[PDB]
Design an enzyme around this catalytic site. Structure first.
Site, PDB file in Angstrom:
ATOM      1  N   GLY A  27      -3.234  -5.318   1.731  1.00 19.89           N
ATOM      2  CA  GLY A  27      -4.074  -6.477   1.499  1.00 19.89           C
ATOM      3  C   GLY A  27      -4.519  -7.164   2.775  1.00 19.89           C
ATOM      4  O   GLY A  27      -3.800  -7.133   3.780  1.00 19.89           O
ATOM      5  N   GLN A  28      -5.704  -7.789   2.753  1.00 22.19           N
ATOM      6  CA  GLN A  28      -6.190  -8.493   3.941  1.00 22.19           C
ATOM      7  C   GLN A  28      -5.166  -9.491   4.465  1.00 22.19           C
ATOM      8  O   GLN A  28      -4.953  -9.585   5.677  1.00 22.19           O
ATOM      9  CB  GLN A  28      -7.504  -9.231   3.677  1.00 22.19           C
ATOM     10  CG  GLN A  28      -8.815  -8.438   3.756  1.00 22.19           C
ATOM     11  CD  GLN A  28      -8.916  -7.328   2.742  1.00 22.19           C
ATOM     12  OE1 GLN A  28      -8.649  -7.522   1.553  1.00 22.19           O
ATOM     13  NE2 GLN A  28      -9.367  -6.169   3.189  1.00 22.19           N
ATOM     14  N   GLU A  70     -12.833   1.208  -4.257  1.00 19.08           N
ATOM     15  CA  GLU A  70     -11.603   0.543  -4.671  1.00 19.08           C
ATOM     16  C   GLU A  70     -11.808   0.110  -6.112  1.00 19.08           C
ATOM     17  O   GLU A  70     -12.655  -0.740  -6.382  1.00 19.08           O
ATOM     18  CB  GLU A  70     -11.282  -0.656  -3.773  1.00 19.08           C
ATOM     19  CG  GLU A  70     -10.118  -1.498  -4.285  1.00 19.08           C
ATOM     20  CD  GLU A  70      -9.572  -2.491  -3.265  1.00 19.08           C
ATOM     21  OE1 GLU A  70      -9.944  -2.432  -2.067  1.00 19.08           O
ATOM     22  OE2 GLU A  70      -8.740  -3.323  -3.672  1.00 19.08           O
ATOM     23  N   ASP A  73       0.844  -1.190   0.000  1.00 18.66           N
ATOM     24  CA  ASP A  73       0.000   0.000   0.000  1.00 18.66           C
ATOM     25  C   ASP A  73       0.884   1.246   0.000  1.00 18.66           C
ATOM     26  O   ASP A  73       1.744   1.408   0.875  1.00 18.66           O
ATOM     27  CB  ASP A  73      -0.939   0.041   1.217  1.00 18.66           C
ATOM     28  CG  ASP A  73      -2.219  -0.786   1.040  1.00 18.66           C
ATOM     29  OD1 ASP A  73      -2.461  -1.378  -0.042  1.00 18.66           O
ATOM     30  OD2 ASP A  73      -3.021  -0.821   2.010  1.00 18.66           O
ATOM     31  N   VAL A  91     -11.573   7.322  17.939  1.00 16.63           N
ATOM     32  CA  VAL A  91     -10.460   8.266  17.961  1.00 16.63           C
ATOM     33  C   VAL A  91     -10.892   9.539  17.251  1.00 16.63           C
ATOM     34  O   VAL A  91     -11.440   9.494  16.142  1.00 16.63           O
ATOM     35  CB  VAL A  91      -9.207   7.653  17.310  1.00 16.63           C
ATOM     36  CG1 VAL A  91      -8.116   8.702  17.156  1.00 16.63           C
ATOM     37  CG2 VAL A  91      -8.710   6.489  18.151  1.00 16.63           C
ATOM     38  N   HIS A 126     -19.493  -4.600  11.487  1.00 12.37           N
ATOM     39  CA  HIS A 126     -18.844  -3.435  12.077  1.00 12.37           C
ATOM     40  C   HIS A 126     -19.242  -2.204  11.282  1.00 12.37           C
ATOM     41  O   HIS A 126     -19.402  -2.264  10.058  1.00 12.37           O
ATOM     42  CB  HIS A 126     -17.289  -3.582  12.114  1.00 12.37           C
ATOM     43  CG  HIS A 126     -16.654  -3.693  10.761  1.00 12.37           C
ATOM     44  ND1 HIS A 126     -16.389  -4.906  10.156  1.00 12.37           N
ATOM     45  CD2 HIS A 126     -16.251  -2.741   9.884  1.00 12.37           C
ATOM     46  CE1 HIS A 126     -15.857  -4.695   8.963  1.00 12.37           C
ATOM     47  NE2 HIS A 126     -15.752  -3.390   8.778  1.00 12.37           N
ATOM     48  N   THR A 127     -19.444  -1.095  11.985  1.00  9.78           N
ATOM     49  CA  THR A 127     -19.725   0.166  11.311  1.00  9.78           C
ATOM     50  C   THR A 127     -19.195   1.286  12.191  1.00  9.78           C
ATOM     51  O   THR A 127     -18.597   1.040  13.242  1.00  9.78           O
ATOM     52  CB  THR A 127     -21.222   0.329  11.014  1.00  9.78           C
ATOM     53  OG1 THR A 127     -21.405   1.417  10.105  1.00  9.78           O
ATOM     54  CG2 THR A 127     -22.009   0.604  12.291  1.00  9.78           C
ATOM     55  N   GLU A 159     -13.869 -12.590   4.779  1.00  8.06           N
ATOM     56  CA  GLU A 159     -13.881 -11.137   4.957  1.00  8.06           C
ATOM     57  C   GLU A 159     -14.452 -10.502   3.697  1.00  8.06           C
ATOM     58  O   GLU A 159     -13.828 -10.530   2.631  1.00  8.06           O
ATOM     59  CB  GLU A 159     -12.496 -10.575   5.263  1.00  8.06           C
ATOM     60  CG  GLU A 159     -12.527  -9.100   5.669  1.00  8.06           C
ATOM     61  CD  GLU A 159     -13.258  -8.863   6.997  1.00  8.06           C
ATOM     62  OE1 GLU A 159     -13.706  -9.842   7.640  1.00  8.06           O
ATOM     63  OE2 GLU A 159     -13.392  -7.692   7.406  1.00  8.06           O
ATOM     64  N   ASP A 202      -9.863  -4.798   8.637  1.00  9.02           N
ATOM     65  CA  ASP A 202      -9.144  -6.066   8.775  1.00  9.02           C
ATOM     66  C   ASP A 202      -8.761  -6.336  10.222  1.00  9.02           C
ATOM     67  O   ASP A 202      -8.840  -7.477  10.695  1.00  9.02           O
ATOM     68  CB  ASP A 202      -7.880  -6.060   7.921  1.00  9.02           C
ATOM     69  CG  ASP A 202      -8.162  -5.915   6.440  1.00  9.02           C
ATOM     70  OD1 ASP A 202      -9.331  -6.057   6.005  1.00  9.02           O
ATOM     71  OD2 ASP A 202      -7.184  -5.647   5.718  1.00  9.02           O
TER      72      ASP A 202
END
Ligand SMILES: Nc1ncnc2c1nc(Br)n2[C@@H]1O[C@H](COP(=O)(O)O)[C@@H](O)[C@H]1O
Ligand SMILES: Nc1ncnc2c1nc(Br)n2[C@@H]1O[C@H](COP(=O)(O)O)[C@@H](O)[C@H]1O
Ligand SMILES: OC[C@H]1O[C@H](O)[C@H](O)[C@@H](O)[C@@H]1O
Length: 453
Positions: free
Chosen positions: A111-112, A87, A33, A428, A341-342, A265, A439
């Site tokens: 990547g995962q 993506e 990345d 945060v 998850h959100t 995932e 991930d």
């Protein structure tokens, strides 16, 4: 609910158990990345130089694979406007070159597979067996030290070796990550949530490239693991899905036959033929992880367009609509576990009863907060620093809704023969970046929950 007390107790319980796991198989997508922190002036000048009207047009049209620079800038703007993670494949040499010259502020494991390998192995100390399409020098350098392994065969016998030994000749697989903060301004637009756009510019992961020794010797490799996390299916299309999906089903059959609990995932999968194929594939998985836009896109292709709209229409995703979607998913697929998850909260719907489901969710939320605060998790002690992050106000408001609509106590209730588990997240206020938090959440909860038994 004394959520601070529950968070602290969950951290200690999981730390005592997490290393019990014999091994985790991770496949298939690993990449590098290259991260750019977007800045308003730079983006505005690039848009002006390219043609503002054309960029804006692409910011209002459905993202497709990127062939021109207006498409790239418009797809970034598409993501900023909506606070959503797009993506797309960058298939044009001209645009790959534009992005290379635009540059990056840092390089990270991508990547995962790679992100979960560095976390589960490098931080938690669990042996991981990772599928890396191209283990170039740079790719290898981004792995942490620790019990992270890639399989090799010497005279027919499996040998696990660390990936920081690169494979001479294999190519860098670059994905460009354009990160933007909450309230990022460009023109008259303002990001409603921190997020990123991902331009995927490698030639291996888009086709779910699988290394020959994983094709030939999958069962021997998989025997070294107790759990599996499967990823990388999201870029496949109706035109190229045949060969990869056939292989994935063969591997899933072996995982099933070996009794290895597997987690899928989910990532946003634009191709609807492939998206429905993945939903059918879930009949062979124990667990699946997804977010609000992914859940909506799945419910949408299962014939519930109005419900999908209800899932994405509210800023804290409408908890009731989300739960209605999770019920439809678990009923259609028969998975034993969904971890949703959100922004503001996680939900789990599980066959398993008891507090260990909640313990794992809270642990994973501590990992998420640490990752958001630091950008990267480097050592186990980082997770405890997540305790200081305050519980977000959105999560507490969602809990009040769920307690009126369901019979809930400390985040736990029942729907039919499933357990519903809720937690509010620790948010945060100014995270460094967002790539990889999903991930971190899914892997941390799936693995820690298993380790608690
Ligand atoms: N990466 C992505 N994340 C979220 N939604 C996406 C997406 N790629 C695509 Br195509 N979409 C689609 O974009 C739609 C939402 O568009 P708007 O936000 O403009 O209404 C969703 O229905 C979804 O199917
Ligand atoms: N500032 C922040 N603090 C804590 N968690 C955050 C965060 N920003 C983000 Br994004 N996250 C979490 O990271 C998750 C990323 O999920 P996706 O990548 O699947 O959308 C979000 O659902 C959210 O819970
Ligand atoms: O979870 C984050 C990851 O998501 C996807 O796999 C992207 O292709 C990759 O670039 C990124 O590192």
């Amino acid at each position: 609910t004394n959520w601070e007390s529950l968070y602290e107790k969950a951290l200690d319980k999981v730390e005592a158990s997490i290393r019990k796991v014999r091994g985790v198989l991770l496949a298939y997508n690993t990449n590098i990345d290259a991260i750019k922190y977007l800045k308003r002036e730079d983006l505005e000048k690039r848009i002006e130089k390219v043609g503002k009207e054309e960029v804006l047009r692409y910011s209002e049209e459905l993202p497709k694979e990127i062939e021109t620079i207006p498409q790239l800038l418009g797809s970034i703007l598409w993501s900023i406007k909506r606070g959503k993670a797009a993506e797309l494949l960058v298939v044009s040499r001209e645009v790959r070159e534009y992005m290379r010259k635009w540059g990056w502020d840092e390089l990270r494991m991508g990547g995962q597979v790679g992100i979960m390998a560095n976390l589960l192995g490098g931080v938690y100390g669990i042996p991981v067996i990772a599928h890396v399409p191209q283990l170039s020098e740079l790719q290898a350098s981004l792995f942490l030290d620790g019990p992270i392994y890639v399989p090799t065969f010497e005279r027919g016998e499996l040998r696990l070796i660390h990936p920081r030994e690169f494979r001479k000749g294999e190519e860098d697989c670059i994905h460009y990550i354009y990160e933007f903060p909450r309230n990022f301004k460009v023109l008259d637009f303002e990001a409603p949530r921190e997020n990123r756009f991902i331009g995927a510019a490698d030639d291996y992961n888009p086709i779910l490239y699988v290394r020959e020794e994983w094709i030939e010797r999958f069962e021997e490799i998989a025997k070294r693991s107790e759990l599996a996390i499967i990823s990388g299916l999201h870029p496949l299309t109706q035109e190229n899905h045949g060969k990869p999906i056939k292989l994935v089903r063969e591997h899933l059959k072996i995982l099933n036959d070996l009794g290895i609990r597997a987690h899928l995932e989910f990532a946003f999968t634009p191709d609807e033929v492939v998206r429905l194929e993945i939903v059918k594939l879930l009949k062979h998985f124990y667990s699946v992880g997804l977010n609000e836009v992914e859940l909506a896109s799945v419910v949408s292709v299962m014939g519930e367009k109005e419900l999908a709209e209800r899932i994405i229409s509210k800023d804290p995703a409408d908890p009731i609509a989300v739960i209605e979607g999770l019920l439809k998913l678990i009923k259609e697929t028969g998975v034993k576990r969904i971890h949703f998850h959100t922004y503001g909260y996680y939900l789990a719907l599980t066959r398993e009863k008891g507090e260990h489901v909640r313990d794992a969710l809270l642990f994973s939320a501590l990992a998420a907060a640490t990752k958001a605060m630091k950008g990267n998790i480097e050592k186990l002690s980082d997770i405890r620093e997540g305790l200081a992050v305050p519980i977000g106000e959105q999560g507490l408001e969602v809990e009040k809704i769920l307690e009126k609509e369901f019979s809930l106590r400390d985040g736990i209730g029942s729907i039919e023969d499933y357990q519903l588990t809720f937690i509010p997240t620790k948010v945060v206020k100014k995270p460094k970046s967002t790539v990889g938090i999903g991930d971190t959440i899914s892997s941390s909860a799936f693995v820690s929950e298993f380790s608690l038994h």
